[PDB]
A paper describes a structure:
Fis is one of a handful of nucleoid-associated proteins that bind prolifically throughout bacterial chromosomes. Fis regulates transcription, recombination, and replication reactions and is implicated in chromosome packaging. Multiple X-ray crystal structures of Fis-DNA complexes reveal that most of the Fis contacts are to the DNA backbone and extend over a 21 bp segment. The importance of the A/T-rich center (-2 to +2) is due to the requirement for a compressed minor groove, which enables the recognition helices in the Fis dimer to contact the consecutive major grooves.
During the course of Fis-DNA co-crystallization trials, we obtained a 2.9 Å resolution structure of the Fis-F35 complex that crystallized with C2 symmetry, which differs from the P212121 space group observed for all other reported Fis-DNA crystal structures (this paper and). The F35 sequence differs from our canonical high affinity F1 binding site at four positions: +1C, and +3C in the core and -8A and +8T in the flanks. The lattice organization of the F35 crystals resembles that of F1 in that the DNA adopts a serpentine pseudo-continuous helix; however, the Fis dimer subunits are oriented differently between molecules in adjacent unit cells (ab-ba-ab in F35 and ab-ab-ab in F1) and adjacent DNA helices in the lattice are laterally translated. Fis binds F35 with 75-fold poorer affinity than to F1, whereas binding to the sequence F36, which contains only the +1 and +3 T to C substitutions in the core, is reduced 15-fold, suggesting that the presence of the ±8(A/T) base pairs lowers Fis binding 5-fold in the context of the F36 binding site. As expected, the Fis protein structure is essentially identical in the F35 and F1 complexes as the root mean square deviation (RMSD) of all protein atoms is 0.27 Å, and all of the protein-DNA contacts are conserved. F35 exhibits an asymmetric minor groove width profile over the center of the binding site where the minor groove at the -(2–3) base step is 0.6 Å narrower than at +(2–3). The asymmetry reflects the presence of the two C/G base pairs at +1 and +3 that promote wider minor groove widths due to the presence of the guanine 2-amino group. Whereas there are distinct (+) roll angle peaks in the F1 structure within the major groove interface, the F35 structure exhibits relatively constant positive roll angles extending from–(7–8) to–(3–4) and from +(3–4) to +(6–7). The overall DNA curvature in the F35 crystal structure is 66°, the same as in the F1 structure (both measured over the segments from -12 to +12). The F35 structure described here shows that the central minor groove within a Fis complex can be asymmetrically compressed because of asymmetrically positioned G/C base pairs.
Numbering used by the authors:
A (entry chain B): 1 to 98
B (entry chain A): 8 to 98
DNA sequence: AAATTAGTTTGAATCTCGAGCTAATTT
DNA sequence: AAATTAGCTCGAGATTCAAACTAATTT
């Protein structure tokens, strides 16, 4: 009665295909594309922060959204994110959202 | 300027970059809409996994399997990297 | 009025880190 | 042969955690 939703189709993005149709592709694939494009524009420059870089690009929208969902309620936001309330306050401060 | 972007296409078949954070934002709005007040619980490990896997995968490809060079690029410890590689069964 | 949340501290537990070593692999 | 990397181990330092609490806010 319940069709399987694989982990990769839980967070998805609208895309356009070779027959000009709108389809949902995983968010992972967006991340793959951002990076292929990041790499292509390196031309041998040194990177030492790729993890923090990516992590930010993802924490900011996540906090942004969960805070809107909870209408500013930090205790609720922490409970649905699955992290300590203090940890959250730390992150909110890090991105100027407190 | 924004280093992490993706390609979008509009109705006039013109292509344009957009920040990766915008995709994430779309994805979450879509997730929240799809659940109607069902409780969300581990949203941080969820997203982090969706992002850490293709990150490891792309960097390992770029360094051709070299874990030591990979960790250096990412700015994390070689142990941490191995640990993450274990976590997602890429070993 | 009661209930919940914000803001804060304290210490325990978990993670991340560099460092250090040898065997295997690449150069 | 020399050089680098993989796979370990061991603390040390940093981070996340849950408890506590009271003031502030929302219900």
């Amino acid at each position: 009665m319940f069709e399987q939703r694989v982990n990769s189709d839980v967070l998805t993005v609208s895309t356009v295909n070779s027959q000009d149709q709108v389809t949902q592709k995983p968010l992972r694939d967006s991340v793959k594309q951002a990076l292929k494009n990041y790499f292509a524009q390196l031309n041998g420059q040194d990177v030492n922060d790729l993890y923090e870089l990516v992590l930010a690009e993802v924490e900011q929208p996540l906090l942004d959204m969960v805070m809107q969902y909870t209408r500013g309620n930090q205790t609720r936001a922490a409970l649905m994110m699955g992290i300590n309330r203090g940890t959250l306050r730390k992150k909110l401060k890090k991105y100027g959202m407190n």
